[PDB]
């Protein structure tokens, strides 16, 4: 029969995006292993306020399930599609659509269905960064303990600058996506990275002040996540449009060294090899969304285009179409 | 930017009219007539059967933009208001069809830009007297670019089973090509169109026969429409044969009854593509480009070189036709 | 504020609808109906043709509002929400007919104040009309009968037979033909001018205290409304129906203008307005939706008059 | 055949708001001249981040183009009505509708479709004389904004702060493209309406307004409309405007400016009491120096004498330019 | 931790008619056991012209598996009411529903997405017998699913033209009755008018093959054959021009032993005694109105009372009301009734 | 038919706003208002915070007809339409709260009849450790000076409010009307434990009060105190928590008197007269998913009888059925000696 996950996805009227972005979440070992095992039942929180009483969990799990069965070429996911319409309604209809902002939701969206927390309860001062890092890690996981936190999950250091009174806040927080600026001829993704590090002039309150100040801002990456989802900010939304820009930028499908942007000098070698790709096409109008993804099974790269799963070459990758990418640390 | 090699933005669910368009826009003998910008006399703002000139005015504008060279992708949103005004069936996220959209835009046109101003109002005579007849009575009724460029005529005989034939001639600016009950040839579903078949309101018995059509004579562009989507009760199926149809040296003089008329051989311009199957669905283009003579693949805002040896497939849903002109 | 002189608030797009309520208004047959207040016992609400009574309870609320003189304005709410849910078509931002509101409150409230409560299933011309008509109120009695219905004869002359086919039709309003400035009278005359395989001519046999003529300046194509600009001259007093009054027997019939529904807007939605006569003091008033003003008698004849309301003069005794 | 400018705007369902901004901004002298001169295509800005990629300028250009062709009576502005409720849908509801509400994101609209500032790049003058901050305040405001909009319709305007603690005197220079003057409370003169725009406010400091440029085009709203939680409140005070002659500079502070004296050139008027209301518009044809009646479709020969009423909502003023 | 079976279904807007339909179909024990038994599988016909490409069979699948686990007390059937939706729109509105108008579609449906048949291919003077066997045979040819199985009865059908006198009889298949109620009545009172003969109105005349005209012939219905599963269908709306109206008469049905036998035009037919097994209920006559729904539960025996999330225990005492609208009836089918 | 026994017709997903009306019309007090006649005088058209007393208007006509005694039901279309109009959150086929509508129209009906043409300003004093009983006299007096209607006649009290700074130990001691008390379940329990519960002190969660010593957002003890309780007093038993994805629904049996309930041991204040309640109406709820459903129990003023209102239909019940898991509101009437 069919290879397991080599299962395109129907589109259901302008779900292309959803498709998309499901592509490459099904392509991540450890989430779609974590489901196939089928041992999550005693993980799903129905009771959380911030949750959707794990149908979103669900509804993702069930569809896995048919896309690694081995038994279809494509499934239409009409149950999931429903569930993700009722819970958040702006990602139905028949307008631009963003892989990104479903993924940001879906990811959320089963950190909560999954949360081990039942009950959620509820300052760095010249202390050193590893206990500030350590210290804002465990409340983070206080309350926030799932299979996303497990997989996706990763640290970074903020430094703020008030102008008035030129007093340094360093705060340690947790993303599970990092919202790569590309630079205003082809662009290496460690430019990228580079540039979200830089330091940049925003506006935000300073406790001092008790104002809003138009203080600097400067990124660090602390600790990097099993899977590291990379994402290009091609898109700016103005007042009456959106922007895109076309940009090339350059992303190696294998051996990406994170190691020297991340700033803790006692931690670990950070090599990852990239496992999917959300691509997006249409300059003008509502646009397309496709995927690049590795079967983890037999090792070998596929092009996902909604129903249509074709056998892809890495050359193919690296476009102008790439907008977020999944990368997979090397352990 | 190269004039004609422009996409076409989706609008929601509007890659039926998109595909529809690039075969259009890739009508040299269309687009020319509205890139000659001397066509506003022959606007037709009262006829009864038109939309007041403003179907004709909505797309006269989105080929001045498809044509300039100075844009890559437009929005059609002008048009796709009008079409939607007019044409509400066309407006809704339903499964859609190129060619339903074809066949209103080609009429929508015709009588947006009829000359015709005021529409005023057979037996054993020979077949060429009857047919000239025809023709002459068509064009006191209906005189525009798009009977210049897309009418031709065939010829309609049906036999009666009781008192045992009438025969009419009637114009077309289409074939709607029926396939065989797999790999078929254009010229198998061409000679399946000409095929007595029997099945009409009789004037001479009253007793309400076999039908057969015959090609009398054929247009400068001939569109031909393969009949792949059938209407079930809760859903529309479609039929996935690969229909083999030459690219270049189209023969239809092999299909004409008229032993005396010009040759017909035709060269294909452009091509309207079909995937999805029995599920939501998405059309495409071919196109050949009028000034550079390469294939084109329009993906809705997306423009591609193409290669021949990508067009007959499986997809293939509306074929446009080019007939040789060479003093005839 | 003088009782009648209510506009009624447009809400949004409704000023065809206002136009018709303020011509049936100004109908003072039909007002005093529901003035008088004891048409309660003719409410239908088991018609099957009828809108359970709703109609004609939202009509007589929104006349006692209008003839109370309490308000210089309402804002028709009530009937406008009963109109929509039995009758969507007249919902939205669309040209709109102000004969097609007209039509359908016409019929509505006759069956909604339908008597019948179960409706049933060679010779001279006087006779058959009077078959005719008592067959007619055998199936429809109501005020609307009473006021608006009229009688036309139809004759059908069938070729190689030679065969003469009448009957008496009724009818509430009149749809008149525009010829290719016109007079009323030239409409007329082609409404009555002769047309299996037949030839039809109508005439008119008996006519109603209200005439509703209907200036047939809209036609419908398929993708577009075009509307006729004609001036029709129609006279403001002593109209003479009984020239095409094909009963020869039948009593003089003199009309008398009481309302017009206007419409305005060469491009676009357009604008429905009314005159009237209010029927205490006799004068003319121009209802633009909220707005009522006193109007001239020189202002009424115009392209812009779409349908006109005629009361029959009953003055002097006649059969 | 028909008189320039003599054109009628068909009802699109509720949009005769719409119709007489677009009748008072047609008969905009400068501004139609702008467009018909047909050079402006070069500064259409289609980047612009604040602008609807130069497709307001557009649509509103093709509409004043076919306005002003003397081939049409009336026309309907689809194009420009689909394009509004493309980037502004609360302009495309069922409900009442604000004329100001639209002409002030047209203006907005069109200036930043046709600003000359590709990249646009608080200061407080500290004991400066105020010819010095007020030029300062609009230097910086053309090196943000650079268009007909603001060559046509920009103004600047002067605002007084004083503490009642310290006594410190805060002034602040600041642009407008047109006047909301509040009515009074407890018939009216505009000038008692500019009057109590300019009048200090008690406010924990005073507030005070003063004009200190005007522009060409003086755009005055006079403010009827309260927006409380349910419902709509109208004031239907008659506010008595000069047609002729409004001499502005009495409220102009700059005692060195120019002498200002405007001509009315446009009004947007506002009718009905319980319903969805009805917008129209006097303006005065710069071709024949005649008033029209514009409402929706239909353009009817006005007089003078009829212009001033408690329906006055939007009024535009033409300054003279004798010297 | 609840029983099986006892689950309500949230009303998704204006569904209570959808939600009463699916209670009386999901306490059809012979269908619910056909799904749970997951014997619907290998039968599941995605390619029939007349079906829903399998997909209302599986919608439906999932949902009765949801109200049989005895994991939930209520579960809302939005993947149910999305595909019915998307197939039939006319049942997604917010306008006055149907139950009867819902369960002719889902009965139509499950049949064509569950028939067997992958490929579909006068009768004068013989007795009926043979005519009605071959009809049954015939209609099998076309027609073999779950649904034929468990609703499928026939009924003969006798027209005569008033011109000839003609006499032609025709055996055809019924899934349900639909009973006219007369102009307190009993349920036989309806049954019989609904065997009564009556002339043919317009506009659906008789095509006579004798006369080759159109005629106002006589039609009368004859009992033939009844299935395991009989539902029974109160006519007690009429669409007029501008609203709905409603019979409120109260029609006396039995709880238990029906004895259908009396009706049966086939005299050599097995003995016919049927037991209530469900109710559609609907209250608000020319009104808005809402759909409720009696079941009882197979596995204990129990009469309850679904009223869209909330089942609650109910008694006998409560089924046989002027609320009544559609009956289930289930046949006996022990040693005492014999073929 | 005997006045004030008339079902509401449902209008499409309507019940929400049938059983608040129901409970409203069964309020003696209110009703008599209405059926009166003579609120005329007091329809507020140009109050900026009022609907130009088009509820009211409404509202009066509906009562009229469910107290004719000549309908069995009635389908309240003006009423739905009004509502809709002002209102549009309460209209479509999604979840409703009658509770909700019940706080819409306590309001809208107040400022529709507010006597007070003209609201004042005026600064609240600093009520600075000045005895309990002179500040509570002042916050009524100011109230009642901006609102004066038929609402804050039936259904208005006051309640003390005492918070407390965790950084400068500052307490601020307010009181505010109220014209129905919100009452938190505890997470079969007793009316009087979600009472006593209402007035526990909590301390302020992820919701800081603003403190003006220290001039920043503090997470402070906030303590409820009953001080004046009105005629008519409506209870809302807080069932519902509407989180960002769904709505919970707390399936408790609440036990309530039907007869009897002795307020005065909740009251603050002690130179009150007793507050003794008997029940005269409840909105009940239904369905733990979907879209749910409401009814209402109410007694009859003219026959002292107890009665079922499900939209069109209603039938005489029985006291031991109203105390159930489905009583969501609860309306109480002062006896008054
Ligand atoms: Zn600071
Ligand atoms: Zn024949
Ligand atoms: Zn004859
Ligand atoms: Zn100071
Ligand atoms: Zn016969
Ligand atoms: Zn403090």
Not at 16 to 31: D, E, I, K, R, V
Not at 107 to 113: Q, S, T, V
Not at 185 to 209: G, K, Q, S
Request: glycine content about 6%; aromatic content about 12%; proline content about 5%.
């Amino acid at each position: 029969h069919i290879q397991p996950g080599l299962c395109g996805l129907g589109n259901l009227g302008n779900t292309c995006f959803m498709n998309s972005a499901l592509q490459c979440l099904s392509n991540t070992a450890p989430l779609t292993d974590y489901f196939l095992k089928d041992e999550y039942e005693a993980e799903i929180n129905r009771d959380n306020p911030l949750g959707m009483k794990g149908e979103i969990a669900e509804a993702y799990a069930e569809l896995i399930k048919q896309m690694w069965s081995g038994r279809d070429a494509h499934v239409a996911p009409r149950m999931f599609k429903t569930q993700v319409g009722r819970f958040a309604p702006q990602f139905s209809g028949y307008q631009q659509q963003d892989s990104q902002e479903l993924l940001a939701f879906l990811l959320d969206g089963l950190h909560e269905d999954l949360n081990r927390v039942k009950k959620k309860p509820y300052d760095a001062n010249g202390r050193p960064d590893a206990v500030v890092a350590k210290e804002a890690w465990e409340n983070h996981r206080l309350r926030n303990d799932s299979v996303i936190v497990d997989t996706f999950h990763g640290l970074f250091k903020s430094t703020l600058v008030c102008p008035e009174c030129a007093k340094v806040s360093v705060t340690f927080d947790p993303f599970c996506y990092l919202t790569l600026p590309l630079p205003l001829t082809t662009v290496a993704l460690r430019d990228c990275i580079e540039l979200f590090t830089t330091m940049e002039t925003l506006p935000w309150y300073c406790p001092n002040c008790k104002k809003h100040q138009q203080a600097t801002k400067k990124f660090d990456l602390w600790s990097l996540p099993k899977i590291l989802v990379v994402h290009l900010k091609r898109f700016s939304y103005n007042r009456y449009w959106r922007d895109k820009l076309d940009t090339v930028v350059e992303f190696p499908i294998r051996g990406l060294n994170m190691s020297e942007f991340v700033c803790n000098l006692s931690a670990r070698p950070y090599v990852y090899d990239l496992i999917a790709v959300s691509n997006h096409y249409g300059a003008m109008g509502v646009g397309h969304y496709t995927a690049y993804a590795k079967n983890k099974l037999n090792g070998k790269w596929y092009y996902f285009d909604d129903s249509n799963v074709s056998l892809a070459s890495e050359d193919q990758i690296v476009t102008k179409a790439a907008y977020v990418l999944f990368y997979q640390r090397r352990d």
